[PDB]
Amino acid sequence: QLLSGIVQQRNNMLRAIEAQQHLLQLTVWGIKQLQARILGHTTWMEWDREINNYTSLIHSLIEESQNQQEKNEQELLGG
Amino acid sequence: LLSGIVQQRNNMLRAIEAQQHLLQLTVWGIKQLQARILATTWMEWDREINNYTSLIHSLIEESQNQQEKNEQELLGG
Amino acid sequence: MQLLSGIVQQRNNMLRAIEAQQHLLQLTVWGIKQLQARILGGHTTWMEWDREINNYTSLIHSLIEESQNQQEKNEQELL
């Protein structure tokens, strides 16, 4: 019931943290590329597409985490 | 009828949400730099960074306080 | 009995992962600002930045992996 739903919620939040870690690593890559130029456009197109896909996945996982949060709260009410 | 562990507010998911706002701000910042390197609004970006950074650290601190209360309730039997 | 314990134990590692990812975020913000002040010695400082990224990335992957291990234990307990 409630503990089951909590465990299922943790799975989605953990996937979101993992996907956000990937997004972080992509931002680290972009910062490093620009720093090496200070001190191609196809590669940046690939960077943009990886950002888009992981951002889209994260928003999906957040939304499903939000949906499970409401199910859990309604599960707790009334019991 | 239940333990407070299973009812407390999910500030962890709130932190995940706010960290995604920060990530998307850093993506925007990187994209602007990229457009000039390869060839005001930045105060607004700085402000938004600071606001979400302040929010996230508040959620982390509250999540840590919940964690301490969760552990103590486990110990209370 | 043990499921509630495992749920609490996982929350600790997931919160630690979120904290470590926040420090990674702050490091990327630092790098973005350094490049922005340039547009609109330092080699050692950037190596120090690179070293902090690596240390926090390694910590995050460790906390994620152990959060996943506890997720599996929790799911198996439910089964």
Residue numbers in the entry:
A (entry chain B): 543 to 581, 624 to 663
B (entry chain C): 544 to 582, 626 to 663
C (entry chain A): 542 to 581, 623 to 661
Task: Quote the study on this structure.
Propagating HIV-1 (NL4-3 strain) in the presence of fusion inhibitor C37-KYI led to the selection of the escape mutation Q552R. To determine the structural impact of this mutation, we crystallized a construct composed of 40 residues from the N-HR sequence (N40) and 37 residues from the C-HR sequence (C37) and solved its structure. Although the mutant six-helix bundle crystallized in a hexagonal space group (P31), three-fold crystallographic symmetry did not run through the center of the N-HR coiled coil as it does in almost all previous gp41 TOH structures. Instead, the structure was markedly asymmetric in that only two of the three N40 segments were folded into α-helices throughout their entire length. The N-terminal region (residues 545–554) of the third N40 segment assumed a distorted, largely extended conformation. However, by residue 555 (three residues C-terminal to the Q552R mutation), this N40 segment resumed a helical fold, restoring three-fold symmetry to the coiled coil. As a consequence of the asymmetric distortion of the N-HR coiled coil, the three Arg552 residues occupied distinctly different chemical environments. One Arg552 side chain extended from an intact N-HR helix into the coiled-coil interior, where it formed a hydrogen bond with the backbone of the other intact N-HR helix. The Arg552 side chain from the second intact N-HR helix reached into an N40/C37 interface, replacing the Gln551 side chain from an adjacent N-HR segment. Thus, in contrast to the wild type N-HR coiled coil, the Q552R-mutant coiled coil possessed dissimilar C37 binding sites, with the distorted N-HR segment substantially disrupting two out of the three sites.
Entry of human immunodeficiency virus type 1 (HIV-1) into target cells involves fusion of viral and cellular membranes, a process mediated by the viral surface protein Env (gp160). In the Golgi apparatus, each protomer is cleaved into two subunits that remain noncovalently associated: an N-terminal surface protein (denoted SU or gp120) and a C-terminal transmembrane protein (denoted TM or gp41). Ultimately, the extended state collapses into its most stable form, a trimer-of-hairpins (TOH), in which the C-HR regions pack in an antiparallel manner into hydrophobic grooves on the outside of the N-HR coiled coil. The thermostable core of the gp41 TOH consists of the three-stranded N-HR coiled coil surrounded by three helical C-HR segments.
